Design a protein around this motif. Sequence first.
Motif, PDB file in Angstrom:
ATOM      1  N   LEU A 135       4.114  -6.986  15.354  1.00 11.81           N
ATOM      2  CA  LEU A 135       3.945  -7.455  16.723  1.00 11.81           C
ATOM      3  C   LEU A 135       2.566  -8.076  16.937  1.00 11.81           C
ATOM      4  O   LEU A 135       1.661  -7.896  16.121  1.00 11.81           O
ATOM      5  CB  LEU A 135       4.080  -6.285  17.690  1.00 11.81           C
TER       6      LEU A 135
ATOM      7  N   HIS B  53      -1.099  -8.421  17.949  1.00  7.85           N
ATOM      8  CA  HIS B  53      -2.098  -7.356  18.007  1.00  7.85           C
ATOM      9  C   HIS B  53      -2.142  -6.514  19.275  1.00  7.85           C
ATOM     10  O   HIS B  53      -2.065  -5.295  19.208  1.00  7.85           O
ATOM     11  CB  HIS B  53      -3.493  -7.899  17.733  1.00  7.85           C
TER      12      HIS B  53
ATOM     13  N   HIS C  82      -7.558  -0.202   6.194  1.00  8.06           N
ATOM     14  CA  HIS C  82      -8.948  -0.540   6.485  1.00  8.06           C
ATOM     15  C   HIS C  82      -9.018  -0.995   7.924  1.00  8.06           C
ATOM     16  O   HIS C  82      -9.426  -0.249   8.807  1.00  8.06           O
ATOM     17  CB  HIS C  82      -9.453  -1.639   5.547  1.00  8.06           C
ATOM     18  N   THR C  83      -8.612  -2.227   8.169  1.00  6.18           N
ATOM     19  CA  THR C  83      -8.619  -2.709   9.527  1.00  6.18           C
ATOM     20  C   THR C  83      -7.636  -1.835  10.293  1.00  6.18           C
ATOM     21  O   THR C  83      -7.878  -1.502  11.444  1.00  6.18           O
ATOM     22  CB  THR C  83      -8.170  -4.172   9.615  1.00  6.18           C
ATOM     23  N   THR C  84      -6.536  -1.452   9.642  1.00  8.65           N
ATOM     24  CA  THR C  84      -5.518  -0.611  10.279  1.00  8.65           C
ATOM     25  C   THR C  84      -6.042   0.783  10.608  1.00  8.65           C
ATOM     26  O   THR C  84      -5.615   1.396  11.586  1.00  8.65           O
ATOM     27  CB  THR C  84      -4.276  -0.411   9.386  1.00  8.65           C
TER      28      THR C  84
ATOM     29  N   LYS D 141       0.842  -1.198   0.000  1.00  2.00           N
ATOM     30  CA  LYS D 141       0.000   0.000   0.000  1.00  2.00           C
ATOM     31  C   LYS D 141       0.884   1.258   0.000  1.00  2.00           C
ATOM     32  O   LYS D 141       0.407   2.385  -0.205  1.00  2.00           O
ATOM     33  CB  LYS D 141      -0.889   0.025   1.240  1.00  2.00           C
TER      34      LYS D 141
ATOM     35  N   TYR E 264       0.928  -4.298  19.351  1.00  2.00           N
ATOM     36  CA  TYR E 264       0.919  -3.372  18.228  1.00  2.00           C
ATOM     37  C   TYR E 264      -0.090  -2.253  18.506  1.00  2.00           C
ATOM     38  O   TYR E 264       0.206  -1.077  18.305  1.00  2.00           O
ATOM     39  CB  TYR E 264       0.538  -4.124  16.952  1.00  2.00           C
TER      40      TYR E 264
ATOM     41  N   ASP F 238      -8.104   0.430  13.681  1.00  2.00           N
ATOM     42  CA  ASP F 238      -7.284   0.058  14.827  1.00  2.00           C
ATOM     43  C   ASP F 238      -6.824   1.378  15.452  1.00  2.00           C
ATOM     44  O   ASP F 238      -6.929   1.573  16.669  1.00  2.00           O
ATOM     45  CB  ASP F 238      -6.032  -0.721  14.415  1.00  2.00           C
TER      46      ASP F 238
END
Length: 534
Positions: free
Chosen positions: A408, A410, A432-434, A354, A413, A437
């Motif tokens: 790392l 979850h 997206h998930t990031t 990305k 991280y 988060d």
Amino acid sequence: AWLMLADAELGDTTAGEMAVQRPEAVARLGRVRWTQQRHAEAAVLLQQASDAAPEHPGIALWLGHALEDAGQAEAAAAAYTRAHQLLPEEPYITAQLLNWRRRLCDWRALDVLSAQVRAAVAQGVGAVEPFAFLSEDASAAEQLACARTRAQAIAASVRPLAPTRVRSKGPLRVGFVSNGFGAHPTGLLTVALFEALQRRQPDLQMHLFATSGDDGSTLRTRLAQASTLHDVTALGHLATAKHIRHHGIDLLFDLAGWGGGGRPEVFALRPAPVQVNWLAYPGTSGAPWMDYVLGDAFALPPALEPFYSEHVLRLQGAFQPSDTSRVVAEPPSRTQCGLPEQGVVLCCFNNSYKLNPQSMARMLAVLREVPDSVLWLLSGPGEADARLRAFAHAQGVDAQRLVFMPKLPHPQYLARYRHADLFLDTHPYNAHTTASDALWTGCPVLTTPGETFAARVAGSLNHHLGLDEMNVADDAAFVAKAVALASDPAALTALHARVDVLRRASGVFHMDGFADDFGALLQALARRHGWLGI
Ligand SMILES: O=c1ccn([C@@H]2O[C@H](COP(=O)(O)OP(=O)(O)O)[C@@H](O)[C@H]2O)c(=O)[nH]1
């Protein structure tokens, strides 16, 4: 001679190796091992056959696959870059070369490879991977073409099961197929939702069809006891299809989509009357067997509906759920995190593919213009980090201002975000998930909502959270907002306090409300196909 026999077996694994007992033979034996997951050996064999023919692309490609699947990323690269020299017009090879270069942040002849691949997609040849294509600067139109092509091939080689219908009797049985149940984005995004549904919509019978074994994560365990989880990891596509059919699933969701195993055939077999595309592949499935896509008003607006082959469905709020039960622990000091104890920490923890030239230039532009700031990135594979430090330097920024964090677990991280001051999103493939988060942690995300679903997910979170000011119009505006927020710490602090409020005030992290909207949508959907209730 006896060779031609061996090959056909690929379509008896050990009967084949039996044949190969007899070069383009060292190579075949090598390929046999690769099939037997014995990657280490397969690479040694193909590495041999490649030296005996350093200008035979069939061998160079095969050796590349083995090296990759043997964890030797950098070397595997040279393998594809070679199978490219010896067969420059074969798009299948170009596609794979391009994808691996992105993952390694090797941008040599990037624009040319990208063009060939997009061109390949337009000719309908090359069999490029839909998930890989998401990293390209292609439009929603190009993406649709890419997907259909893969779908239509799969559709050709498969005969659908006997047709059935939604029950009309109820309870409604909703199934979910994924290889990501536990310690993977998919499981991470849906646990809180399934726990909420189990508690707030007992009338709806949840079924999870996991195509991966138990990995020992808390997520897998929570999913298992918040639904009926079927481990169909060992079944072939037909058996798996018949298995879902055996449970009378009415609404089946594809939470794997293109890429990530996925088991595409399982869905082609049409084991359920209604099949939905949601939350796995951030684009149109472009498949004849997929009935609906579940998006939202922002990420999948009306102007984009034409490019989705499936009928568009939208939830009231954002399309993406999240694990709202995650406690964000305290990270080690900035120092122990390799971060200067003083200065603004700008971060982007997105996957390496990305991180393209455009997105990187963008981030560097902020550093260059705001002294004392650093760019915290997620350490990439191969020598990606090295190439990035180099690029940074060539872009006028002390390569030492880039700090790379190792992947790392979850929980650990997640805690790192507390040291972040601003999350810088990438384009055309957003976090997206990031992205969620970061937001869950309270770290603001800056993004440039594009014109493809995948380029508007971070924007949808911002929009639905109430932070429209973080959804800017372009790179210039992107650098501007970052430098503004970065230069004035009173403002940054103000933005963090604002995210913390919207976080609690907005629906985005209210899974109980999500469970209801989602459930309401499932029942309306069912009623539209014959269901009567009860
Ligand atoms: O150090 C890290 C970095 C990432 N992740 C997780 O890795 C997955 C990232 O997947 P990906 O980039 O493919 O997903 P996306 O951003 O597109 O949703 C997400 O669950 C992140 O939460 C993690 O657990 N530890």
